[PDB]
Ligand binder design. Sequence first.
Ligand SMILES: Nc1nc2c(ncn2[C@@H]2O[C@H](COP(=O)(O)OP(=O)(O)CP(=O)(O)O)[C@@H](O)[C@H]2O)c(=O)[nH]1
Ligand SMILES: [Mg+2]
Lengths: 81, 192
Amino acid sequence: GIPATNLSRVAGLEKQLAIELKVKQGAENMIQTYSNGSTKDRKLLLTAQQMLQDSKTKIDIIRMQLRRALQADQLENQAAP
Amino acid sequence: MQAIKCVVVGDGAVGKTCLLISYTTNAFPGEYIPTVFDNYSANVMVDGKPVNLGLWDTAGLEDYDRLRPLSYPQTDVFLICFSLVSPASFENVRAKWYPEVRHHCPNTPIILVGTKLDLRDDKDTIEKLKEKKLTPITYPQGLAMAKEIGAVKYLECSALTQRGLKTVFDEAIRAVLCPPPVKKRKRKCLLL
Ligand SMILES: Nc1nc2c(ncn2[C@@H]2O[C@H](COP(=O)(O)OP(=O)(O)CP(=O)(O)O)[C@@H](O)[C@H]2O)c(=O)[nH]1
Ligand SMILES: [Mg+2]
């Protein structure tokens, strides 16, 4: 695994999370676009909702794991699961 | 206002956003920043009839598999972008893009684009291709490709010189008006 460069892993999750942020924020923007009134087709608004939900889960796991990284970073006695 | 959904895609490394921006700004400012947004329409003149154009370019990101262009499915017509000076790009466009569209058989028209024309008609550059044993594509070569894949129309253009950018969009629009229509709707489930 990683020796003392545990800081690298943490930043990696920050990056991954941020990437997903663009994904989540992207879908939401599209949602607000079709949310107002009825333009083009409703199918577009639906796709934005589903893709957005998927991203929500993405951030949820990445976010929690990130917290796990900093947690295990402080403690040096407790072993990993 | 005739609003048509056209999505620009290409197996190449880049050239997806530059193609659309060149026609809307007459000059690509550059920018290497990835693509996330979508809202981007432009007015086009076809036969003297104002037409609303929907510009949607997909970024070269795999993670955005889910956040893929929502327009793509509804896209009245998608443009096939490849490098003319490189036969390989032409070899793979029909190789991967064709088997996918046929799997659904939407009967949706398909236009062909020959981006990067500035280096396609460049003697010195062409000479460089020889170094790699590659040769640029000619007009009749692509024309034949349109017949096999049943493409509605095939043309070549440049974003730097603007050979026939307007022609691409102009013809792409007709792709839905004259040839068979589009309109494709299908839900996955009641709840998400
Ligand atoms: N001369 C010339 N250069 C072109 C042409 N098309 C693309 N390019 C060059 O390639 C670049 C491609 O830009 P762009 O299409 O925005 O990149 P992209 O693929 O969208 C970036 P990403 O895939 O990460 O979203 C242009 O900025 C330009 O330098 C063309 O027709 N002619
Ligand atoms: Mg782009």
